[PDB]
Structure formats: C-alpha cells, structure tokens
Symmetry: C4
C-alpha cells in the first residue's frame, strides 16, 4: 500500500496573508451589524474575543475587563489551584461576569477542576500542545462524565480528524491552532503545524456538522485577520500578543530605550516553564497600549467595517457566505500601505 | 438545517496585481509618438490622457484641477470643505479656459444640496465616493441623481466585483470606479481584511462593464507608469492616481524638509487627520504620511504618458481600444519581479521615472 | 471572438531564480567538456559569451581581450560612424580575432554598416528596444539584400512569433531579452516584458526549426544563470553587468567608500542618451565593483559552465541544449540555494 | 522532441515549503524511539551524523558524537597517515563507531586500506557529483575488495542516481546537491534539486532495495531534521549546527562580545588550499559542548514524532504527512510581531 507514501505532499495550506475577503452586496452599515456570538446557551458573548490563558496575558483584572467589554478571559494555570480558584471567584464577585480557566491534562487536573467548579467558573479550558492525543481525549471523557453541564473547551488541534475525535469525546467548543502563535516556535523546533486559515476552515467543516463552535487561536496581528478567521468558520477568536500590551494584563510596565513595554512570552518558553527541556516558545515584549477599551474598540470596529463590506448583518451570515480570494506575496504588498513615508501611527496600525 | 455549496468555494478564487504579471510584446507598426492616448468616458466627457487626479485633500484642488485639465486630464476636487467653497473651486477651474473639472460627493443627506451647487457651477462630472460601492446607500443615491439630472456624468464607486459594477450601471452611473484597498496609503485590507487584487478587480469589472458599453476607472495601486499601462491593458478606460500626484507643485500643501530634502504631506482620506477636520471614536482605514517633492505637474505627466506610449509601442497598440482588446499578460513570480526592477547595481543617479 | 479577452492571463513565465538544473548521469569531467559554439559558418566561438554593445561595456580594448578569451565583443554605437569603423579595424588588426558592432534603426543605418563592412566586421547587431516591429523588419531585409553573406544579429525579442519574424526578414542570429537587464526599467516604466528564461525557451523553440542560433541577452548575475540560459536553448549568452568591473571595459575607476568602482549605465538611461525634461528613459545609471582583468572574471564564468555541464553530463553545449532538464522551486528554495544562516567572512572569486 | 518539452515540468520542495501535519497520538515524546539501523554492522541510537569537513568533524568531534549515539565522519583534507590515526584514536576511545571520508582519486584505495586497517566502521565516498561514472566505478572497485565494508556514496539528488549507485554496491546513499548552508553550487553551476524533494525522490527508489538514505545539508533547525526524516530519510548529516560546538576543530574567535567558530565549505578557496570554488567561508556562533546542541536536536525530534503519533522513526518514515505553505505561511511559522528579548536554546 503506497497510499501513505504517495500522499505526503498533496495537501496545501493557506494563512491570513495569503488571502483577501471579497466584498459583496451590502444593505447594512458597520454600526448596524451584530457582532454577537454563541458558544452555548450557558456561554454567550457580545463580542467574539477571548483573551489567551497565559501568565503574561490573563489574570483576574484582565478577565473582568474582557467580560465588561462583552468578551471572555481565560485565567492561566501557572498558579496554585487555590489561587486560580480564588481568582475565578474574584471575577464572579465583580458583577456576575463570565470567566474561564485553563486546565492541563495531568494527574491533579480533576482536583483543579473541582475548585474551579466550586468557584462557579463558566468554562474550563483543557490546554495541551497536541490536542489529538489519547490522554487528552480520555481526559475530556472524565470531565464530561462528572460534569455533564460544564462547558469544555478542548485544544489545540489543526485537522478534521482531531476535531471529530474531541467532539465525540465531549467537547462543547474546539480550540484550533498549532503553530501560528506570535511567540511560538513549534513549527520551527518540531517542524509540525498547519497554516491557521486552512486549519480553522478544516476544523470548522467537521465541527459545523456537529453544531460545534470552533475558536481561532493565535496568528492574528491586525483586525483584518480576525475578520478572516471568523469568516473561515470560527465562532470566536483568541488573542495573546494584541492583549499583552494592554494595561489590565498581568504585569508591571518595564522601560526599554525610554519607551513603555510589557513582558510577553510563550507558555512553552524557558521563563514560563521554570516558574533542561526543549522549549516550543520564546520570551519577548510588546509596547504598552494602555486600557483594554481602546484596543477592543479598534478590533471590534475593524470587524464591523469588515462585516459591512461582506454585507453580513451578523456573524453567522459571515461564516456561511463570505468568500475569500487568493493572492501572491505581491498582492500582500499592495494590501499593506506602500511607497509612502509614514508620518504618524494609526490606532489600528500597526497595533 | 442546510446544504451549503458556498462553503466549498471559499478559497477557489485567486487574484493578480501589477507586480504579478507583465505585458507581452507584439508585432508593432506604430511608433510611441504616433500612438493615441485619447479616451471617451461619455458623450459629454473626453480626456486626451488617461489620467485623473484623486479627490483627496492632499491631492486635488483648483490649482491641481486647472493644471491637470491643461495637461489633457481631469481633476476631482475633494469634498473636505464647505459646499460653497467647493462650488467656488469648480467655478475657478471652469473660468480658467473652459477646462474640464470633476467634484467628489459622499453619500449623505447633504448630498443633493451639495450637487445642486456643483451643477450650478457647471461641473462636468461628480464622483460618488464611498468605501463600499456595492452598498444600498450608494445605489439609491445614483438613482436619485440620475432622476434629477438625466444628463449629468456620474462616476460611482468604489467596487471590485462584477456584480457590483452591474449594480452601479443599472443605477444610472455613467462611469464605474474600481479599487478596494490598493491605495498607497490604504489599510482597508489590513484593518477590515477585505479586498481584491487590483488587476483582477479591474479586469473582472471591465468584463461586466464591457457588456453595457460602460467605461471603468482603475483607482489606486499605481506606483510606476508601467502599472498604468497594465491597468489600461487590463480593461480600464482611465486610471486615478493619488501618490504620484501628491508630490507635485500644484498639489495642495506647503513643502517641508525631511530626510535632507523637500517633501509634501500625503494622507488617506480615511485616516485620522483627514477626518478630524471634517468631524466637528473612529477606526481609520488609511495612514498619514509624506511623499517627496517632484516640482511642476508637467514633468510628472510627461513621464507617465511617455511610459504609456512606449508600452503601447511594445504592444503594437495605435490606440487604447486596441490595447484593452488585444494586449496579453504573462504571470511571473517574485523572482520575476526582482528581475524586472534594476538589480545587482548601486544606483547613483535618480531617474525621472524611477525612485 | 471573445478569445483574446479571455486568454489574457493564461501564460506563466520563468526567470533564472525559479529553477534549478537537475543533475544527470555523467561520464565526462568538467575540464573535458566542450564549450565551443557555432553561431554561423563565419562566426565560431571557443567560449559561449559576448560582451554587450554598451558605452560602458565594450569598446576596442574590451573587444580584443574578449576575443582572445574565445568570446566576442560588440562595439557600441554611441560614437560617430568614423569612430566605430575605426576601432572595429583596431580589433581586426590585433590578430585574426573577431569583432561585432551595434547598428541602430535609423535613416543613416545603411551608411554606418557600409563603413563597418569596409572595416570588415564579422557581425553587425541591429539593436533596438522593440525588435518585433516593421521598422526593424524592413531594415533587416534591406541589409540582407545588400549584404547576402553578412552575419546579422537582430533584436531584441521575447516571443516565438517575433523570432520567426526576424528570421524570415533575413536575420541569421536572434538576440533575446525584453527587460531582464540589471540596469533596465523597461518592465517598470512600460509594463512590458517576458521572464528571460521563458523568453529564451520560447524563442529557441521557434528558431530551432530553422537552424537559427539564439543569444540569451540580459538577466545574468551569477555564472549559474549562464548555464541555465544555455540549457534553455540559447547558443550563446550576452553579459553587461559582469563585464563592467573589468579593466578592459570603457570608463575609468571611481572610488566609493574605500572601494574601487566602475560606472555601469543602461543605453536607455538619461546619461547615455545625452552624449550620442526631453524624453523618458528605460534604464538607470550607477556603479559596479572593480574586478580587475577580464581573464579572471571570464575564468570563473567558464569554470561555472564546465562544472554545470559536468553535473548534467553534457560533453558539449548541444547535448546541454537538447537534454538538460529543469526543476521549479519557490522562494524558499532560492534561499536554500544561496548560502544561509552562516555569516560570510570573505568574498569568494565567484560569489558576491 | 520529448526531451525538449520536458525541460520545465518538474517542481521541487524544501524544508521551508511545508509543515508536518499532526496526527492522532497515543505516545509521549519521551517514550518514542529514535534508534535507527543503517546496516547490520552500523546502528545508531540517534539519527545524527557529523559531516566530514575540516571545520566540523575530527577525532574530538567523532568521539563526542559517537558517545551520544550518533556518528562522526573524519574529513579527508589531511594525509592518509593522519586520518588513519584519527580513526584509531576514536576506536581506542571505548570502541566507538567511526566514519571516514574518501574521495575518487589515485590514492583512494590506498587511503581506504589504511582506514580499513584502523578498523573504520564506514567509509564515505564523498563526491560533488554522485551520478558520475567515476564514483560508480570506484564503488564497484571498493565493494569487490571489501564485501563486508560499509559504503556511503554521494552525493545524488535523483532516483536514477540512487539506483545506479545501489547497483554499484553501496549500503547507504547520501542525498544533497546544493542545500548546504555554506554551498554555492546551485549559484555557480546552476545545478541542484530542492532537498526535501530530493530526499523523497531518492528514498522512494532506495527503499525498493531496502537501502537507507542520508539527508545531507539544508538543516538550520531541529524541525528541519524531523521533516527530512519524515520525507524518507533514515538519518541526517549536519554541518553548520555542529561547527559551533566545543568539540569541533578550530578555536573560539571573538567579535563584539559574542564567541564564534570558523566554518567553511570544502569546496571553498580556503579548504582547497585558478580554482572555481563552490562554497564560501564564514563563521557560526559558539554553542558550548556538543551535548547541549544534541539535546535540543533530539528533544525537538521527539516533539515532532509525538505530534505525528510516531512511536519509532519507521512509522514517521512511512506515515507522516506534510502540508504545503507559502512565504506568508513561513512568516507565521516563525515568531512574528514580537521583539525577542532572550534567545531560546533551540531558536537562533
Ligand atoms: C502551547 C505549547 N505548545 O504549543 C506548550 C506550552 C507549554 C509547554 C510546552 C512544551 C512542554 C514545551 N511542549 C510540549 O509539551 N510539546 C509536546 C509535543 C508533543 C506532544 Cl505529543 C506533547 C504532549 N504531551 O502531548 C507535547 C508546549
Ligand atoms: C475611502 C475610504 N475607505 O476606502 C474611507 C474614507 C473615509 C472614511 C472611511 C472610514 C470612515 C474610515 N471607513 C469607512 O467608511 N468604512 C466603511 C466600511 C464598510 C462600509 Cl459598508 C462602509 C459604508 N458605509 O459603505 C464604510 C473610509
Ligand atoms: C534597450 C532600451 N530599452 O529597453 C533602449 C536603448 C536605447 C534607448 C531607449 C529609449 C529611447 C529610452 N527607449 C525606447 O526607444 N523605447 C521604445 C519603446 C517602444 C518602442 Cl515600439 C520603441 C521603438 N521605437 O521601437 C522604442 C531604450
Ligand atoms: C562538496 C563539493 N561540492 O558540492 C566540493 C568539494 C570540494 C571541491 C569542489 C570543487 C572542486 C570546487 N568542485 C567540484 O568538484 N565540482 C564538480 C562539478 C562537476 C563534476 Cl561532474 C565534478 C566531478 N568531477 O564529479 C565536480 C566541490
Ligand atoms: O509557548 C507557546 N508555544 C506555542 N504556542 C503558544 C505558546 N504560548 C501560547 N501559545 C498559543 O498562542 C496563542 C497566542 O498567540 P498570538 O495571538 O499570536 O499572541 C495562545 O492563546 C496559545 O494558543
Ligand atoms: O484613507 C483611505 N483609505 C483607503 N483608501 C483610500 C483612502 N484615501 C484614499 N483612498 C483611495 O486610494 C486612492 C489613492 O491610491 P494611490 O494612487 O495608490 O495613492 C484614492 O484615489 C482612493 O480611491
Ligand atoms: O537602458 C536600457 N534599457 C533597457 N535595456 C537595456 C538598457 N541598456 C542595456 N540594456 C539591455 O540589457 C543588457 C545588459 O543586461 P545585464 O547583463 O543584466 O547587465 C544589454 O545587453 C541590453 O540588451
Ligand atoms: O563547499 C562545499 N560546496 C558544496 N557543498 C558543500 C561544501 N562543503 C560542504 N558541503 C555540503 O554541505 C553539507 C553541510 O551543509 P549544512 O548542514 O547545511 O551546513 C555537507 O555535509 C556537504 O554535503
């Protein structure tokens, strides 16, 4: 059987910069469109934005800000169970907001989940590097079996086989993304990954047939990518780098060459793990952006504008009807502003 | 439930831009100086050259519109001013020598009031400028202007699809403007993620517009004279330039020394600065910047036309109709683009038509 | 007939940096291969390369050294009729070596050629921006009629139909290249051109039916490009930028930031056209690093060809033209092809 | 006129063109097997071979490589006496596996004799063009004299060359024409085949004869090695990623507060000391002891095989799938839009 040998290089992948959204007939202004989205009856959002579960991205103050903006925050797991449980309770006491918490496939996973459920968390996030693993699937089964009503976000995966496997396991929402992270080196050190736009589209295609929403995680640098991700089949996107510079992100502002910066690093980086192994991430920094409200406004505003061009009144019409168009690298250069000295920065370009 | 066929066509379309192709040479019986660059937009509108200056606050006002018209082209006076002022600019150009002049109009409730003054100032064409030309507000506005002014030249845009062009034409538009996101100072494709590669956009719109005997305008993306030849060869009747005109003397704005030499301010109309003056929080779709000073407009126009004449000479095109209907392209890679530009040599002197 | 409108973006073109020559079975060592080429009964070269007819590339001194290496030189036409016919004879009297001279499509074209024939050139180059035009077509007919046995090299062209046109006009050698020049902007200011390698392959395809040789003109920056051009069907290549740093080339040495340089400019540049706000140039002017004698540069070029032919197993250029295969690669391949992830300490005699 | 129309048909791929597609896994990365068997006389515990160059592999490197489960190839830019001594030096350092480079020359068989007497485990017939009649005749000459000897001949990049070379009597085929970090062969000769395609085309032919192949050149990250192995290679050979370690020949030089070591191609002017070089000369960063580089290399392999659901290198060789991407894909694959503060032990 040469089926496997003769099909090693057949597949093709696309990402955000390979593609443009084709404008269609619009009977709706950007301010008129609806950006609401539903993961489940117990989990509904006013904006399709979820902050990443990372030690440099989301804690108590970040989750409260995201929820009050209409989004969701996933509290990272690089803390004790008691700490994460009382961080969830802190967010819930802050006005009955929505909040999530990250959990890993370990031995104390169910022990941590108990406290999170005891803290009345809305959704736990089973975060692993390879979501198509047997341990992950088996772990999801244990959770659903004990908590039939609890929202379970399982990831990360990048194929249809993996999405189906987790859906049958019992996951309500499937997080998609192997490699596209701004601080990720998984595709560099392991040589493993799938281009994000193709990944989201492939995983959605399977998940769309189960009534299962998918999360576009990592890879988004501009507002336009979020629109591309949602139109590719995603119900909601997850951001790390664009939320790291935000004031409400966990961290103290440092100074580099006079400017204000915030520490942003991978969970698979050396620094994050220590708090010798082979890292699948790096340690870096992003400019301080101020309050979250300004970043959200630029992001959501870009989505509204994008939905307006496609004639999409709401997010579902976008997924069902939006058409992309492929372009070369030369098209990307035309897409970006070109051949002009940039006097000053825009609040949506670069960040 | 549903059975979606649109789902499997999400990534089937692919688009080309200027740096993706080259014009293939052909048998030629005409010298570059012998060719014709004249075009017809409508019965009442005719240009000797395929150049139109963009309706931007940093590109086209009276002095620009006058200079452009005297070169054989057309100038679209921007709408970032009062209705009276705009009508005054249109009058100033019309009086100068019976020169042609255009005016930019947005889809507002003030639109008809603005157009009334423009027509009274004897404007030759109005441009219905909007980020999304395939919109109801635009289409409905075209109907309303065509009804009240049955003989007024209406330029409608911007669109990037064939269905949109067809929609504008049936709304009563004389000319269709094509270009979503290729602008030098544009970030629409970056902040909204929406667009079509300009050469593909121009070509597809021209395919639909051909059916109705309607001309189209290639707007944005042009950074060299060769790009203009491609746009016209793609099927466009006329090109619209913003960045190559902004550094010209007649353009609005004073000169400023940056990086050791003279520069002129050039910004996108969807940028912060270009809208905070006509506002009294937004998400911009353009940036603010500056382009190098290039002196009188005549020098720029001569380079553009000359490059067009050479390109038409390589193709054997005695006129622009033969160019649109006969010219062939050839798709190349990024490696082909590097070969096309000068390479492996330190350029010591600045060329009139390069960098 | 909506065919012409629908067949607008069908064609795809390849340049040198899109392909690699696939190695083949070899029973011949690189030093054993034959690099000799036959353009005509009267024009035979030991090595397959010609110095371009430009005012910063080829005059008498360059033409002589080029011919002593087994190549050919084309005296540029940026000089009076007397000046060109003069230093053509200057080459013709430094041995029995060969020499060429560029001629334009003017009202006094025939007058210049007559002086060159009296100076006894081996080949004239009817050179123009657009070879596929009646002005050039009827000019070749004129020369071919007056001089039945004169080697006529017409160009430039980039399509098979154009190559066919020049051959039937009277040209026995066709020069290929519309815009791949290093000092060229024709592609940028006119939007016109064909990716050189595909241009050579298309032109050679048609020209081969008539037994007519093809010159791969322009677009060569490394010796590997030459091997690809010859393998693409070309008999001989023509160089400009690689011959300008050579001492024998016209112009004097300029020093920039501690290094020696020599002026290299396009014949369509503003500087070239001024000598002989007006016109629109299709070329630029600049400088290239001084290389020294022609012998050193020409040794690295042929050496690359000999190695390249050895990999493909070609004993002579004919076997290379008839059998050598390519393989396309993306931008990721091109970067792998060049040195990478290693900080170069010294310049190599044949790399950058 | 079929050979004329065939010229521009083929398409090639390299490491930066694709990504490995993650598959269902029941295995942890630390549990996977990275052992490999080239021949019954030559078995490696890790799929890493130190390249036979004068800036990469000598006695000190070959010993350190062998103790990690890898292999070292002593370069032949030295006398027959010296190379045989280096071979004997590694062998008397605990009976470690050693390899030695041999070229196609007059003193070829003479050199091989001295290496055989020094009990070399494998000889590498290292040539620029493996598909030449000279190398083929040389392999035939060597195999006839030493039936039980391991012969690694190269380099090739086609299935034709691999077949003709296996028929010559070689046990291992080394693949790679031009992918080298210090190589200019594709630039100066215009000849080459994209490594990942070359490995695939060669391994396709080779496995029909049950013959292993070496992926030689082009690797800049551990992920590339995983790709090379998943393309059909039994084992890879590294130059630049080893030239900076402490066990490599050459001493640390210093430039602007960062340590470097010399690394140049064997086809460069320096290593060949008019000559027409097919390589350049330069320097790579100093990376301390070999065990740190190797740890990252293998650890990255285990991660890859983990994602692919591969329990051993044979599974990865027969089942792993690739997905093709553009330049934008590669941009997304590497970190982006974030100013890297400190360097990872496995990333630049
Ligand atoms: C998100 C992420 N990678 O994408 C990450 C986060 C923390 C640690 C790590 C580390 C431990 C460095 N990498 C890691 O666990 N990789 C890995 C690779 C392959 C498999 Cl099969 C597994 C696994 N345990 O399933 C894990 C990775
Ligand atoms: C020309 C241009 N964009 O190309 C532009 C000009 C001024 C403001 C703007 C701003 C206000 C920033 N954006 C804007 O009008 N966006 C937009 C997006 C989508 C739609 Cl459907 C619409 C619309 N109302 O047609 C407008 C854009
Ligand atoms: C080689 C080359 N251009 O690529 C060149 C050389 C000298 C002058 C020129 C100038 C005069 C600047 N350009 C030029 O003659 N271009 C040109 C363009 C199109 C045609 Cl159809 C013609 C022509 N007369 O055939 C010439 C160009
Ligand atoms: C490894 C390598 N090239 O990849 C190399 C090593 C040393 C010298 C050389 C030199 C001498 C510079 N080149 C070389 O042998 N080239 C070459 C080219 C073509 C052939 Cl057919 C041959 C050959 N005789 O096999 C050799 C190359
Ligand atoms: O250390 C890492 N290695 C690989 N992926 C990571 C790592 N840390 C975070 N990620 C992923 O990348 C996402 C953020 O990527 P970003 O949106 O490009 O900033 C996170 O939500 C995770 O899914
Ligand atoms: O701010 C903006 N955002 C997006 N497009 C713009 C903006 N302002 C002007 N444009 C378009 O871009 C064109 C100029 O493109 P350019 O000639 O390539 O500089 C104008 O004629 C408009 O069609
Ligand atoms: O100014 C010019 N414009 C366009 N092509 C030129 C010009 N000058 C020289 N060329 C062509 O470019 C060739 C040199 O290309 P190079 O070898 O890549 O430097 C010449 O032999 C001519 O065919
Ligand atoms: O100078 C040379 N010219 C061409 N290839 C070379 C030369 N020197 C070494 N190589 C090859 O390149 C490999 C190293 O490439 P790297 O692993 O990418 O550094 C070696 O193992 C050889 O196969």
């Amino acid at each position: 059987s040469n089926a496997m040998w003769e099909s090693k290089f057949v597949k093709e992948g696309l990402t955000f910069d390979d593609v443009l959204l084709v404008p269609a007939k619009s009977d709706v202004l950007p301010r008129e469109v609806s950006v609401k989205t539903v993961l489940s009856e117990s989990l509904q959002l006013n904006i399709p934005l979820i902050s990443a579960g990372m030690d440099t991205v989301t804690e108590a103050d970040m989750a409260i800000a995201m929820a009050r903006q209409g989004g969701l925050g996933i509290i990272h797991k690089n803390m004790s169970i008691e700490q994460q449980a009382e961080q969830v309770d802190k967010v819930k006491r802050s006005g009955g907001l929505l909040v999530g918490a990250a959990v890993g496939v370990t031995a104390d996973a169910m022990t941590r989940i108990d406290a999170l459920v005891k803290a009345s968390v809305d959704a736990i996030v089973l975060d692993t590097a390879h979501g198509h693993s047997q341990g992950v699937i088996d772990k999801v089964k244990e959770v659903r079996a004990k908590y039939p009503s609890l929202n379970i976000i399982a990831g990360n995966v990048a194929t249809a086989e993996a999405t189906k496997a987790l859906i049958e396991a019992g996951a309500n929402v499937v997080k998609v993304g192997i490699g596209p992270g701004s601080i990720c080196t998984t595709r560099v050190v392991a040589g493993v990954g799938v281009p994000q736009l193709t990944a989201v589209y492939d995983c959605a295609t399977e998940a769309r047939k189960h009534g299962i929403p998918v999360i576009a995680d990592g890879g988004i640098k501009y507002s336009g990518d979020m629109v591309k991700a949602l139109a590719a089949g995603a119900h909601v996107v997850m951001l790390g780098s664009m939320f790291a510079g935000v004031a409400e992100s966990p961290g103290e502002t440092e100074i580099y060459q006079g400017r204000q910066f915030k520490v942003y690093r991978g969970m698979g980086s050396v620094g994050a793990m220590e708090k010798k192994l082979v890292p699948e991430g790096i340690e870096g920094r992003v400019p301080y952006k101020g309050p979250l409200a300004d970043t959200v406004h630029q992001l959501v505003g870009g989505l509204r504008a994008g939905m307006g061009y496609c004639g999409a009144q709401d997010l579902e019409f976008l997924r069902e009807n939006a058409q992309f168009i492929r372009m070369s690298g030369a098209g990307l250069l035309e897409s970006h502003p070109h051949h002009v000295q940039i006097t000053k920065e825009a609040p949506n370009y670069s960040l």
